[PDB]
Request: fold
Amino acid sequence: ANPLYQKHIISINDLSRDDLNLVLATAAKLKANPQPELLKHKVIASCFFEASTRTRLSFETSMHRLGASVVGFSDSANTSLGKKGETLADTISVISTYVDAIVMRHPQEGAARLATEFSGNVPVLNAGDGSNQHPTQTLLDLFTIQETQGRLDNLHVAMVGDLEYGRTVHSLTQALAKFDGNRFYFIAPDALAMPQYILDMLDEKGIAWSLHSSIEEVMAEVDILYMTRVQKERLDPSKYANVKAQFVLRASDLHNAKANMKVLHPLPRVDEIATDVDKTPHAWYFQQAGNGIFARQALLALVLNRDLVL
Amino acid sequence: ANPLYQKHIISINDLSRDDLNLVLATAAKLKANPQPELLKHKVIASCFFEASTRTRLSFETSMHRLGASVVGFSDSANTSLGKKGETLADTISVISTYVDAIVMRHPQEGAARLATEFSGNVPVLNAGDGSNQHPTQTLLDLFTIQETQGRLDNLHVAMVGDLEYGRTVHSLTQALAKFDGNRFYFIAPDALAMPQYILDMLDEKGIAWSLHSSIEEVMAEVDILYMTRVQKERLDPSKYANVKAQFVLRASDLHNAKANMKVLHPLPRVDEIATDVDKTPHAWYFQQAGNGIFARQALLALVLNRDLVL
Amino acid sequence: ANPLYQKHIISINDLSRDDLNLVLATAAKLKANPQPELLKHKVIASCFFEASTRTRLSFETSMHRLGASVVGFSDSANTSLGKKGETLADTISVISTYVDAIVMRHPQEGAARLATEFSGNVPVLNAGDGSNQHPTQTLLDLFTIQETQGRLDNLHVAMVGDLEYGRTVHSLTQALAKFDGNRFYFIAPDALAMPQYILDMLDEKGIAWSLHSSIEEVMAEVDILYMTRVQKERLDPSKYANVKAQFVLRASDLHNAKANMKVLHPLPRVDEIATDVDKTPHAWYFQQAGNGIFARQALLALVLNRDLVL
Amino acid sequence: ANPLYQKHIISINDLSRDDLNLVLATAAKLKANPQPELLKHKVIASCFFEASTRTRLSFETSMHRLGASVVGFSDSANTSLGKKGETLADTISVISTYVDAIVMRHPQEGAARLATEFSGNVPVLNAGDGSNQHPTQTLLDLFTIQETQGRLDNLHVAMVGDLEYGRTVHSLTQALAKFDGNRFYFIAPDALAMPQYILDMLDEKGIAWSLHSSIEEVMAEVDILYMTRVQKERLDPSKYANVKAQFVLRASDLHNAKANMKVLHPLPRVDEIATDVDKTPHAWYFQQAGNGIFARQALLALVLNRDLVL
Amino acid sequence: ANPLYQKHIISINDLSRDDLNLVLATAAKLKANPQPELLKHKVIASCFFEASTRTRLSFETSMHRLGASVVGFSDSANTSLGKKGETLADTISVISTYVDAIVMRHPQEGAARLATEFSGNVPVLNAGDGSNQHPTQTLLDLFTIQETQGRLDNLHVAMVGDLEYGRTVHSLTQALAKFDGNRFYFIAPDALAMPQYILDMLDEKGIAWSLHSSIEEVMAEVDILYMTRVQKERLDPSKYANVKAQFVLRASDLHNAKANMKVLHPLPRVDEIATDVDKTPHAWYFQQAGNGIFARQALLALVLNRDLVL
Amino acid sequence: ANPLYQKHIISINDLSRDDLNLVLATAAKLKANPQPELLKHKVIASCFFEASTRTRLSFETSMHRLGASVVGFSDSANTSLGKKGETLADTISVISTYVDAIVMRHPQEGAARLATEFSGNVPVLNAGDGSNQHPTQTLLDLFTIQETQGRLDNLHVAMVGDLEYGRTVHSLTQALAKFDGNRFYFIAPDALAMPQYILDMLDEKGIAWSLHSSIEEVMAEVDILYMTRVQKERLDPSKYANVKAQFVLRASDLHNAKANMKVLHPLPRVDEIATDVDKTPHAWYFQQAGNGIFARQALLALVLNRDLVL
Reply:
C-alpha cells in the first residue's frame, strides 16, 4: 500500500515532506491523465455542517471525476443550540456505517479529529474545522506554486493582508517551512501582524523573513504574491481608508515584477484585487482554484485506493 | 460537429428555425431510443441562485438520464444578498474550472449571458434569468406542440391569461413566428393585453392575430390552447371575481373542440384549470411536463457531444 | 416476477408475513453480496417535503449502492402547511413522468397513499407520512432483531418511553404480532401508556403482554430492549424530573441481562441512553442504523427488479 | 341631551348635515378655548387591533387634552392567525366593563359595528375598519375645509389620484354632498375611475361633477385640491409610464391657483406630492393633520359629556 | 398602619382569612364610592415580561381609576433567548428606583418572589408567574362569589374541566377553604384529575368534596359553577371523543340550577361555554372580569396608602 | 427666560459648562423637592423608532413625575426597510402639530438633528441617534459623579472596556474636559484603544491621561471607575478568554480603593461586574440609573417651563 491508504487527513502538520510530494505528484498525474473510474463503487459523504459552497462544489466535483458516488447535506446557519439532540459523535457513529469515506466541514475546531474517534475504519478528510485546519486548501496552494515555479524550494514568497486571523497563510507558511532556502515577506497593517509562534518557528529553522508595510518594497523580487482578504469589521472604518490603498492591488503595481511571478488568492476577493490584474500573466487565482480539484482528487485517490497508478 | 456543439444556450432569439428543428429532432430520437451513457464522465453544475424546484428536478433528471454527474446548489431567498462578497462573475470564473457545463437560474435578467463572459469554453445553459428568458421551457413547449399536431406550421393557437407579464407565452409566440401559416388568438382581461412590440413583430411578418375576451369565441377552431397563470395580486380582488370565470377552464367548455386539440400549461396551476379537464383527451400539461426531460436531454446532448446519433 | 415487483410500499399493514421474510432475506443477501449495478440506469426521486436528514441520507445511500441515479429535494419548514399553488397530486402527476420510482416523506398522513393515485405505473415508497407510517424504519428494526436473535418468533421484547405518541413502536409491535410466541413488556409514565386498540389486537391474537413502570422489573429476561425518545414538551417539566430516571438507561442497569440481548433505538437519542452503554455488547443502535441501508436496498431491489438474485 | 351623547360613531353615512355641523362647531370651539378637564376621570381604551401609528397618536393626544386617561394596545403581524380562539365579541364584552369608551381600529370591515353589539352602554368610536369607514379622518377633512374656506357650501373641490380605492375621497364626497352647491372635479390616471354609486348619488342630489385627465384643466377654478395616497401595488411600472407626473404635483403646477386654494392630503404621501409645494401657501396637509385632534376631541367630548355647552 | 401597607402580594398562600376579607371589603367600598385621587402622584410600573393583554388592561385601568400614573412595557417572542445578559435582578434593581410599585408578569415561576429581594421599599404585585401564582385573578374570583352570594361560607361550589392544570381552580379552592362550611364538587373528563395535595388539604380542614363525571349529577345543588379554560394541547382529538359535551356547557344544561347560581370562568373561553348560556341569568363571566378592577384597585390602594379609611 | 427654554437638546457638544451646571442644579433641586405639577397640561411624544426599553422607561417616568401626559410608540426591529412610505421628515412634520415636545431615539445618526428642521417651535430631545449622541446618558453620568464627589473638577477618572466603540465614555470624556484639573486613565484590550481625536483634544487642552492594560495599575488612586460593556462578537472568542479577566471586576479588586470612589456603569452589565461588588459601598450603578429620572426631569423642566423654581 501507499503511505496514505486508509489514513485520516486532518491537519497539515500531520504530513511529512514525503507525504506532501506524494500528494502533489498524484495531483500532477491525475491532471495529465484522468482516471474517471478509479473510485467506481465507492460512496463518499459530503458533510457540510457549516455551509461553504465554493468548498463543497470543488470537493464533490473531485469525487465525481474519480467515478465515486456522493451523498450529503449542507447545514443552515445551524439552528438555536445546534443539532441539539445529536452529539456530533453519534452522527459520525451512524454515517460511518453508510459510507466509504467522510468529507466534513464544521464551525467548531477539532470536529474532524473528533470524528476520527467514532468513524471506525472509515477515513475522514477535514474540509475545514472552524479556525484550525483546512488542508486541501493548503495542498491546492502548494500544488499551484510548484506547478508554476517548477520547485518548492528557494522561493521568494510574499504574504499580504489580515495576517493575524488569516489561517490560510499560517498553514501555507508552516508547510513551505518543511522546504529549504525559502524566503518570506509579511505585509500587514500593524495591529494585524503575523502571530509570533510562527516567526519563532521560522527563526528556529533558520528561515529568512522580513516584516514590511507596503507591497512596493518587495514587488521587484518575489516569485509568489499570496493575498488574503482584509475585512471591514476587523479594522474599523476610519483607520481602514487611511491605510487601505496598499493592501489593494492594481495592474500598475506590477511594472517591475518577475516574469515567473504569479499572484495567488484562496478566494473570494472583494476589492483587494482590482479586476485589471485579471488580464495579466501574473493573475493565477482562478487557475489555483482549478487546481483544487486535482489536489482533492489526489487525496481521495491515495486514501481510498491502496496502490497508486502514476 | 453539429451546429450547437460547445455553444451557449441563452435566448430563444439566438436560435434559427434550423436550430429549433435540430433540437426537436434530437428530442424525438432520445425519447424513442435512450442513450444512458452519452455523457458518461461529464460533470454538470446545477446552479440555482434562485430556487425553482420544478425546474431543477426536470433538468437534473435529464442529466442523469444521459449518465452525466451532477453537482450544484439551490439558493435561499434573501436574508439580504445570497452573495454580498462574490461578484457573479467571480463565481462563474471559479465554477467554470470545475465543470463541463453550467446550467443556471438567477433573479437578475442577463445573468446567464453575463456568465458566458467568464465561463471560458464551458457552455452555459440559461434555466431562467429573471423575466427575460427560459429557453428550455419554450423548447419543451414547441416539442410538445409538434409531437401532438405532427407539424409546427399552419396551426390555430390560443393564449390565455396574464398576457402582459406571462413571459412563457411571449417566447412561445416569438418562436412559433419563425413558422409559416400560424394563427394566434389572445384572451386577456383588458388591462393585461399582449405587449405591442410582439404584435408589431406579428403584423410585420404577416401573422394573423385576433384579440378576444372569452375562450368561447374561438374554442371550436383551435389546435392548441395554452394557459398561463393569472395572479391574485396583479389584478385586485374586487375586479378579479367579476371577470375571473372565463380565465377558468372546465370540461364543459370543451363540447365543441377539435379531436386533435391539446390543452397546455407550463405549470403549476392553481384554479385556472378545474380538475375535471384532467380526465379528458385534451389535457396534455402533464405530458408536456414529461417532455421537458427530452427537450433538456437534447440540448445537453447537442451541446456536450460533438456529433449526434439519431 | 417476485411478489413485490412494481408494488407501492406504503404501510406495514399492507405486507404479509411472507412479504416481510422476503424483504429480510433480500436484505441479508445484499449485505452478504453487494450488487452495485442492480439498478444501473434507474433514476429515483428522493422527495422530502418534510426535511429529515437521517432518513434521506440512509435512503439515498441505498440507492447509490445499487447503482441507481438520484434526484430530489428537501423542503424548508414546509413553511406553513403547503406549496401554495401546486396540489400534491399535480406534483406527483409531474414527477411520475421523469423517474422510475418515488421515495417521499411528508407532514400530512396519507400523502404517500395519495401519490399512488397519480403516479401511474411508478412505484412510490413511503419514507414517512406525518404520524401514520414509516415502513423502512420498521423493516430495518425487524431485520436488526432477526439478525441478532436468529429468529423472529418466541422473543422477549421490551418497549420503553413515549408509548402513546411513539409510532415507531406501534408499527414494530404490529409487525412482530404477525409472528408466534412473542411476549411484550411496556414501560411508560402512566399518562403515556400504549394505546388500547393495540392491546385489543394483542389479546385477540393471544399475545402475552405486561404493563410495567420501571426497566428493572424485566431487565433480567428480555432479548430486545427497544427505546423511544421521551420529550421535554409532552410531559411537563415538574413531573418530568420526578419520574425521568427510569426511562434513562445506564450501563449499571445491565448487570443481570442476557448475553443475547441487544438494545435498539431508532435514533436520535438525547439523554435517555447514557453514553456509557455504548461500549457494552448490548448497544446495537448504531448497528441497527447501518442495517437501514440493507432494508432499504432490499426494498428498492425487489420493487424495481423483477426477479431477485439471492 | 346633546344629539350625540352616548352614541356610536361608526360610519360617515350615519350622520346628518346637522350632526356634521355639531361636530365641526364643537371642534372649533375646543380649538379656540381648550377644556383640559372636560373628561377628567374618564378612562378610554385605545384598541388598535391593526397597527396604525399616525392615527393612534392623534386620538390618544386628543384624549389627554381633554383630561382623560388612556389604556390600550397596538397589535402585531399576528402569529398563527389571531387570538384565534377569542372572538372579537368576547374581547369587546370584557374590555367594555373596564372603560368609558372604546376607540378601535381593525383589519376587518364591520368590526366597529360588531363591537357596539356587545359594548353595552359604552360608546365605541371607529378608527378604521378595513377598507370600510374612517369617520374621524373624514371629519378632520371637513373641518379643515370649513376652517380655511369659511364654509362647506358653494365650493369647487377636486379629487386626485386613485379614485377606485381612495376611501378618503369616497367619504369626503359623500359628506360634502350633504351640503348645497358644491361642484366636483375628478382626476384619475384613466384607470382607477370613481365608483358608479357615488356618481349616481350626485346626480339625484343634482350636483355638478366633471371628469378630467390632468389638473391643468381645473386648477384655476378649485378651492380645495384633495390628493389620495397611492400604493406601489395599487399601480405598476407600466401605468406610471406616459402620464405619471400629474400624479406628481409640483409647485410649478400651482402658478394659477386661486389665492384661497388649499391642497389637502390624508397622508402619508410617498412621491405624489413633491416637497417644493410644502413651502407654498397652498400646502395644508400638515395643518390638516393637526386638525385631527380637534375633530377627535369633539367626537369624544360630545359622546361622553351629556350637554356640551361651548 | 393597615396590615397590607407596603407588603408584597406574591401568592394566595401568603394571605390570611382576614387579609382576604380586608381586600374584599376595600374592593366593595371602592366599587361603591370611587376615590379617583387616592393615589394621585404615584407612578406604577406595568411590567409585562410576558404579554397578556386582558390582564394588563385591567391592572392599568385600576391604576388610572385611583389617579396614579402608569409606565411600562409588554414584551415579545424573545429574539435570542432574552435581555440575555441582563438578569431579572438587575432589571428589578433599576426599575425600583423609578417607581412606587411594580406590577409584573413573567414566564418563570418565582419571578415575582425574586423581584422583592431587589425591589427595596417598592412593593411588587404578582400578575402571573409562569404556572405558579396569579393572586389578583383569585381575589377577583372570591370577590365575585362574595358579591353575588352574600357570602364565602356555606357554599356549594363545583369546579369543571382540566383540574390537573387549572391553576385558577387550585387557587380558588385553597382560598375558599380558608372559610367554613364550603362543600366542593369536582368534575373532570376522567383524565386530568385534581392534585392530591389539594384533596389532602381539604381532608385535614374537614371539608366535604365529591368526585363526578358530568355536571348533571351536581347541577341542582351548586351555588357557583366555575369552568377552567381548556387548551388544544392540554387535550387531544382522542379524549374529546365520547364525553366532550359537559366540556361544552349549554343553556339547556341549566334548567334545574338554583336561581342564585352563577357561572364563573376566568376567560377567555374558546368552546367550553356555548354562547347560548350568555343570555341566561347565570352567566357571570363578563361581570366577573369587570370585578377585576376592584380587586386590583383594592390591592393597590391598600399597599400604597398607609391607612385606608373606607 | 432660562437659557434652555424652548431649545433643542441634541448633542453634548452644543452645551456650555454653564448649561451643564444649570441642568445639574435643576436635577438636584427637583430631587430634593419634586414638582409633580410643573408640566401639568403638557403632552410629550415618546418616539422610539429604535426600541430601547431601559431608556423609554426612564424618560417616561420623568415625564409623569412632572405631571405631563405621554403618547408614543416603540418600533419593531425597523422591519427590513424602516417606515418605507413616510420620510422621517414628514413624520416629524405631523407629530409636531400634536404635541408640546418630542423625545426620540433612532437608528440613523443625525435623525434628532434632522427632526429639529421640521418640528417648528416644538423642542426635540435626542434619546439616542445611532452611534452619535445620547445626551441624557452623559448628563445622568455627570450628575451622578458630582453628587458623590461634591465636585466635577480635579478628579481621578478611570474608563474601562470597549473604548473604541463605547460612545458612552467618549461623551463623558468630552464633557468632563470642559472642567479643570481632571485626570483620565484608559483601560482597554489593545485593538480597542480610545480613538485618537479624543486624545488630541485632550493634549490640546492640557489634560493628563495615561493608557493602561489592567485595572490594578490605578485602582488605588481613582475617584470614579466607569465601566463599559465588552462584547462577545467584537473581539473573537479565542483572544477573548486570554485577556478577559482584567476587564472583569470582582470585590477582591477593591482592597486598596478610596473611600470616596464609586463604580459606575450605564447598564446593562452581563459578566463584566461580578455580583459580589453589588454589596460594597463602591457600587453605584443602580443609584446612577435612578439619577436618570432627575437628569431627565431637569431637562424637560428647563426646556418646557420658561423660568425655573429652585
Q: What stands out?
A: Residues 285-304 of chain A form the longest helix (20 residues). The radius of gyration of chain A is 20 Å. Strands of chain A lie at 43-48, 69-74, 101-106, 124-129, 156-160, 183-187, 209-212, 224-227, 262-264.
